[PDB]
Protein backbone atom coordinates (compact mmCIF):
# COMPACT_ATOMS: atom_id res chain seq x y z
CA UNK A 1 0.00 0.00 0.00
CA UNK A 2 1.33 3.37 -1.24
CA UNK A 3 4.22 1.30 -2.65
CA UNK A 4 4.28 1.92 -6.40
CA UNK A 5 6.65 0.63 -9.06
CA UNK A 6 9.15 3.38 -9.98
CA UNK A 7 8.87 2.64 -13.71
CA UNK A 8 5.71 3.69 -15.55
CA UNK A 9 4.84 3.06 -19.18
CA UNK A 10 4.25 5.35 -22.13
CA UNK A 11 1.04 5.34 -24.12
CA UNK A 12 2.84 5.42 -27.47
CA UNK A 13 0.22 4.77 -30.14
CA UNK A 14 -0.16 6.61 -33.48
CA UNK A 15 -3.78 7.50 -32.60
CA UNK A 16 -2.67 9.80 -29.78
CA UNK A 17 -2.52 13.52 -30.38
CA UNK A 18 0.50 15.71 -30.90
CA UNK A 19 2.69 15.70 -27.81
CA UNK A 20 1.82 12.12 -26.84
CA UNK A 21 3.99 10.49 -29.51
CA UNK A 22 7.40 8.77 -29.28
CA UNK A 23 10.18 11.26 -29.84
CA UNK A 24 13.77 10.16 -30.42
CA UNK A 25 16.12 12.65 -28.78
CA UNK A 26 19.93 12.57 -28.87
CA UNK A 27 22.09 14.78 -26.65
CA UNK A 28 25.61 15.83 -27.65
CA UNK A 29 27.92 16.26 -24.65
CA UNK A 30 31.11 17.09 -26.50
CA UNK A 31 33.74 19.14 -24.69
CA UNK A 32 36.09 22.03 -25.43
CA UNK A 33 39.77 22.74 -25.77
CA UNK A 34 41.25 20.97 -22.76
CA UNK A 35 43.01 18.08 -24.53
CA UNK A 36 44.55 17.70 -28.03
CA UNK A 37 41.78 17.71 -30.62
CA UNK A 38 40.65 14.28 -31.70
CA UNK A 39 37.81 14.89 -34.15
CA UNK A 40 38.23 18.01 -36.15
CA UNK A 41 36.88 17.61 -39.70
CA UNK A 42 36.23 20.90 -41.47
CA UNK A 43 39.02 21.50 -43.98
CA UNK A 44 38.49 22.44 -47.60
CA UNK A 45 40.94 22.99 -50.43
CA UNK A 46 40.51 24.65 -53.79
CA UNK A 47 42.05 23.82 -57.15
CA UNK A 48 45.74 24.45 -57.85
Amino acid sequence: FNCYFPLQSYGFQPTNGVGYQPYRVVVLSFELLHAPATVCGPKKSTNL
Binding site: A35, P36, A37, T38
Partner: protein, 49 residues
Protein backbone atom coordinates in the same frame (compact mmCIF):
# COMPACT_ATOMS: atom_id res chain seq x y z
CA UNK B 1 59.53 11.60 -26.34
CA UNK B 2 56.53 13.11 -24.56
CA UNK B 3 55.75 16.79 -25.02
CA UNK B 4 52.41 18.58 -24.30
CA UNK B 5 50.31 15.43 -24.47
CA UNK B 6 52.10 13.98 -27.49
CA UNK B 7 54.04 10.74 -27.77
CA UNK B 8 56.78 10.74 -30.39
CA UNK B 9 58.20 7.47 -31.70
CA UNK B 10 61.18 7.94 -33.98
CA UNK B 11 62.95 4.94 -35.37
CA UNK B 12 65.26 3.12 -37.76
CA UNK B 13 65.98 -0.50 -38.72
CA UNK B 14 69.40 -1.74 -39.84
CA UNK B 15 70.95 -5.00 -41.05
CA UNK B 16 74.01 -5.72 -38.90
CA UNK B 17 76.73 -8.33 -38.23
CA UNK B 18 78.12 -8.06 -34.69
CA UNK B 19 78.65 -10.43 -31.76
CA UNK B 20 77.69 -8.72 -28.49
CA UNK B 21 78.24 -5.01 -29.10
CA UNK B 22 76.78 -1.90 -30.64
CA UNK B 23 78.56 -0.58 -33.75
CA UNK B 24 80.32 2.68 -34.60
CA UNK B 25 78.81 4.78 -37.35
CA UNK B 26 76.19 7.31 -38.29
CA UNK B 27 72.48 6.65 -38.64
CA UNK B 28 69.60 9.12 -38.54
CA UNK B 29 66.17 8.33 -37.16
CA UNK B 30 63.17 9.04 -39.33
CA UNK B 31 60.04 10.29 -37.61
CA UNK B 32 57.43 7.58 -37.50
CA UNK B 33 54.55 8.03 -35.05
CA UNK B 34 52.94 10.90 -33.17
CA UNK B 35 50.10 10.28 -30.72
CA UNK B 36 47.89 12.95 -29.09
CA UNK B 37 47.38 11.07 -25.83
CA UNK B 38 47.47 13.67 -23.06
CA UNK B 39 48.60 11.75 -19.95
CA UNK B 40 51.44 11.79 -17.43
CA UNK B 41 54.15 9.17 -18.02
CA UNK B 42 56.89 8.32 -15.53
CA UNK B 43 58.03 4.68 -15.85
CA UNK B 44 58.08 2.00 -18.53
CA UNK B 45 59.08 -1.57 -19.31
CA UNK B 46 59.56 -3.60 -22.49
CA UNK B 47 58.23 -7.10 -23.15
CA UNK B 48 60.00 -10.34 -24.08
CA UNK B 49 59.15 -13.55 -25.89
Amino acid sequence: KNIDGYFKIYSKHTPINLVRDLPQGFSALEPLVDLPIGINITRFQTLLA
